[model samples]
Target: GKRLYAVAYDIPDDTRRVKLANLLKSYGERVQLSVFECYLDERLLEDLRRRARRLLDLGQDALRIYPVAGQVEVLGVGPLPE
Candidate 1:
């Protein structure tokens, strides 16, 4: 089965946030303002983490990556990447 991951970020700097968002867009779908859904295998997942790390400031920026169980519940606008 394919592996899925969710990346959510809280960036203090507008510039950094935008940069991170743009970078993520190439690798995944933007589900929300600062959240992205990525479908990646082991290799791709590692690449994403390496790339995303360059944009982080350690103490200032917050980045969270979680493994998804390949299930989701949609409400309101429904699922992303329509």
Candidate 2:
């Protein structure tokens, strides 16, 4: 199976991030803030890639999507696990 992850950086504002988050929710599981972890078929990943790019204002935010075969990196602790 192919795993796709959306990695966002330097998001323009909290509002944009929220919007993007909602969009990604349809395609994947939001495992962390600004990150979405998804199990995707090839076509779905491609569709998501296209939609995600358009979702971004680009001038304000940046996103990168890549395939994962094995391990992942989680930088920084998140919100003390609620």
Could you say which candidate leads in lDDT? 1
Can you write out model 1's per-residue Cα lDDT over 1-82, one digit (the tens) per residue? Answer: 3477889999999999999999898778888887898888888888888988898788899989898884576677836432
TM-score, structure 1 vs. true: 0.86
- lDDT (10s digit) by residue, model 2, range 1-82: 4665555545878877777788778886766666777668888877877877876788878887767765565668742221
lDDT of 2 at 25: 80
Task: Give the alpha-carbon lDDT of every model.
Answer: 0.83, 0.70
Give me the displacement of residue 75 in model 2, in angstroms. 8.6
Predictions: Cα RMSD each: 2.1, 4.0
Backbone clashes, each candidate: 0, 0
